[PDB]
Amino acid sequence: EVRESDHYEEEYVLGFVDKWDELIDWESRAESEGDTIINILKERGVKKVLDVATGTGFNSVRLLQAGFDVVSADGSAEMLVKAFDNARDHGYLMRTVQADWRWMNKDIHDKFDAIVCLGNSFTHLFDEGDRRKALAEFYALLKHDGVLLLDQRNYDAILDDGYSSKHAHYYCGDTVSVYPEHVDEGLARFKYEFSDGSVYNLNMFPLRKDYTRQLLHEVGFQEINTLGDFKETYKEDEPDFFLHVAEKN
Ligand SMILES: C[S@@+](CC[C@H](N)C(=O)[O-])C[C@H]1O[C@@H](n2cnc3c(N)ncnc32)[C@H](O)[C@@H]1O
């Protein structure tokens, strides 16, 4: 029945991350990414980190290499297998937990100095109730002085700049291009095209910057610093990403 379709959408994204990891090696990605995330955590004396969007494990492995104690959670068991084996290949024992954002402490019973939700993951929630619930679950998993690091694409530029926003964005040189095929206030569909000709189309929710900030404030975070993050190969006046640094207190 509809199990075939749900299996297809999971397999589609799994193929997407496999293609990304096939053509974009992690060392190139680590050097392109700053050490900004790591230093932010270090400056706050973070030891214990929960990654709630492990995916194939890049953020988790980077934090393990940096010396953090990391728990690697993801809603997808198949992602966590890839993440664990990638960490293994880099010489690290990952601690994987399958967990849905709407009930994060079902199987995670510890509290954390920081949570990372990176790679533009939070945009995958299309329901506002789910968005609030997810952020409340993260908030409850933080120690009193903990911090949430949560990023997203800059959807404001696409929703507002109009004709000047209808162009592709490139990552890791020219290895992948990302083109906004369709954007309205409720839905953004991007075309991802890789250097080998592979094409994937992915849906996400186009969170406005101040909306995300409003959600974070509303579930109880007391201080939110939003940083512009220029990750694309051909920089523009507007950053293509934002990084929210939300302090529980
Ligand atoms: C874009 S990937 C991020 C990968 C990694 N952070 C990186 O940048 O390399 C987003 C991940 O979040 C997970 N995810 C999406 N919705 C979720 C939910 N409701 N609960 C738990 N995980 C979810 C997906 O399984 C996927 O692995």
Residue numbers in the entry: 15 to 263
What does the literature reporting this entry say, word for word?
Betaine biosynthesis is accomplished by three N-methylation steps in which glycine is sequentially converted to sarcosine, dimethylglycine and the final product betaine. Two dual-activity, SAM-dependent methyltransferases sharing an overlapping function are employed to carry out this three-step biosynthetic pathway as follows: MpGSMT adds the first and second methyl groups to glycine, and the sarcosine dimethylglycine N-methyltransferase (MpSDMT) catalyzes the second and third methylation events. Similar to other commonly exploited regulatory strategies, the control of betaine production is achieved by betaine-mediated feedback inhibition of MpGSMT, the first enzyme in the betaine biosynthetic pathway. Consistent with previous sequence-based prediction, our structural analysis validated that MpGSMT indeed belongs to the Class I methyltransferases, with a characteristic seven-stranded Rossmann-like α/β catalytic core responsible for substrate and cofactor binding.
To test the validity of our interpretation, we investigated the feasibility of preparing crystals of the MpGSMT-sarcosine-SAM ternary complex. To this end, we first prepared crystals of the MpGSMT-SAM binary complex and transferred them to a substitute mother liquor that contained sarcosine and SAM. Indeed, X-ray diffraction analysis of the resulting crystals showed clear electron density maps corresponding to sarcosine and SAM in the active site. The B-factors of the atoms that constitute sarcosine and SAM are comparable to those of the surrounding protein residues, suggesting full occupancy for both ligands. Superimposition analysis revealed that the structures of MpGSMT-sarcosine-SAH and MpGSMT-sarcosine-SAM are highly isomorphous; no significant structural differences were observed, except for the minor reposition of sarcosine in response to the presence/absence of the sulfonium-linked methyl group. Our finding that crystals of the MpGSMT-sarcosine-SAM ternary complex can be successfully prepared strongly indicates that the structure reported here represents a catalytically inactivated state of MpGSMT. To our knowledge, this is the first observation of a methyltransferase in its catalytically inactivated form despite the presence of both substrate and cofactor. The validity of this hypothesis is backed by the finding that crystals of MpGSMT-sarcosine-SAM ternary complex can be prepared without triggering the methyl transfer.
